[PDB]
Design a protein around this ligand. Structure first.
Ligand SMILES: *C[C@@](*)(O)[C@H](CCCNC(N)=[NH2+])NC(=O)[C@@H]1CCCN1C(=O)[C@H](N)Cc1ccccc1
Ligand SMILES: *[C@@H]1O[C@H](CO)[C@@H](O)[C@H](O)[C@H]1NC(C)=O
Ligand SMILES: [K+]
Ligand code: NA
Lengths: 259, 34
DNA sequence: GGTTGGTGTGGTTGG
């Protein structure tokens, strides 16, 4: 997260860390939607162009974390994956269309002050809040700057970062990039003439873009950190998977079995 | 199956459940007016 | 020492 701040403890208790078993590596963010389901971005698990194809046994999920690197004993829960379900129409070749994936835990996780699921949106919440100028919140342990070129500052934070960002009008999203945008995506971030900054970055993929309902004051996940071009560049906007638009596939897998 | 947690989703134990707002949460509410 | 750092021996938490 670029230009965000340290998150307060318990502030994003649905924040999940997707972790590579060996070598040990923080891979992406993800979110908790129940005691046994985790949401993340498909490209975090499967991205053929970079030779990325993870399997359930390669991964771990770290739930309830704050610190990026120390083991928060008796706070965080580490869970194995029973199954990974990638959207069957995830377009990895073209533009990360339907950049979403569900991960089923081996064993259900107990909730606590640091572990609680976020709500999935319904039509009224999406119709009401997914509007240009309306702000959402993005969280992650991802990069603090573009790390692929020389830049001042630490590349990673010691603690989870947060940043609030305004959703942007689709025409502006569409004209800001040559990558073909889709209705399964939405962009957010300040414009150059707004004089406020912030963006998700590499390493934040799979984290949630959440909004707080002013109707029942519950937090809802509207988007999944998906892609962008650079991090916090003027005229550019971070892109997010449109959770509600893929809601039907989500219910479909989550409610498939009764076990 | 969905599992436990749907009915209580989106209510944070250290904030909403204690009637405590976090530090920038009002900034979201304010952007939702008009 | 510990499926990990240090103002430690609690803490966002045991031993
Ligand atoms: C996987 C994620 O961590 C990451 C999120 C980046 C979000 N960036 C901003 N500024 N909000 N996604 C990626 O790195 C994806 C995977 C493929 C490369 N990529 C991009 O976002 C490229 N930067 C752009 C792109 C390339 C090909 C297809 C779509 C987008
Ligand atoms: C990913 O790897 C599995 C086996 O490990 C393979 O069956 C699957 O087809 C791969 N997906 C790709 C590269 O499209
Ligand atoms: K200790
Ligand atoms: Na920007």
């Amino acid at each position: 997260i670029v230009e965000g701040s340290d998150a307060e403890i318990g502030m994003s208790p649905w924040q999940v860390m997707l972790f590579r078993k060996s070598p040990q590596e923080l891979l992406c963010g993800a979110s908790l939607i129940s005691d046994r389901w985790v949401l993340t971005a498909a490209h975090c698990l499967l991205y053929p162009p970079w030779d990325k194809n993870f399997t359930e046994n390669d991964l771990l999920v770290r739930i309830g974390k704050h610190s990026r690197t120390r083991y928060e004993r008796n706070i965080e829960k580490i869970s194995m994956l029973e199954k990974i379900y990638i959207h069957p129409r995830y377009n990895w070749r073209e533009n990360l269309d339907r950049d979403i994936a569900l991960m089923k835990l081996k064993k259900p996780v107990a909730f606590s002050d640091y572990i609680h699921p976020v709500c999935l949106p319904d039509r009224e919440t999406a119709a009401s809040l997914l509007q240009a100028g309306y702000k959402g919140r993005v969280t992650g342990w991802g990069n603090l700057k573009e790390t692929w070129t020389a830049n001042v500052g630490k590349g990673q934070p010691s603690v989870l970062q947060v940043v609030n960002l305004p959703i942007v009008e689709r025409p502006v999203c569409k004209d800001s990039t040559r990558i073909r945008i889709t209705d399964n995506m939405f962009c957010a971030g300040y414009k150059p003439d707004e004089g406020k900054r912030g963006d998700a970055c590499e390493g934040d993929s799979g984290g949630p873009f959440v909004m707080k309902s002013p109707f029942n004051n519950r937090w809802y996940q509207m988007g999944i950190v998906s892609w962008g071009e650079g991090c916090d560049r003027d005229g550019k906007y971070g892109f997010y998977t449109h959770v509600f638009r893929l809601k039907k596939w989500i219910q479909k897998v989550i409610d498939q079995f009764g076990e | 199956t969905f599992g436990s947690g749907e009915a209580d989703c989106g209510l944070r134990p250290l904030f909403e459940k204690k009637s405590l707002e976090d530090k920038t949460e009002r900034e979201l509410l304010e952007s939702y007016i008009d």
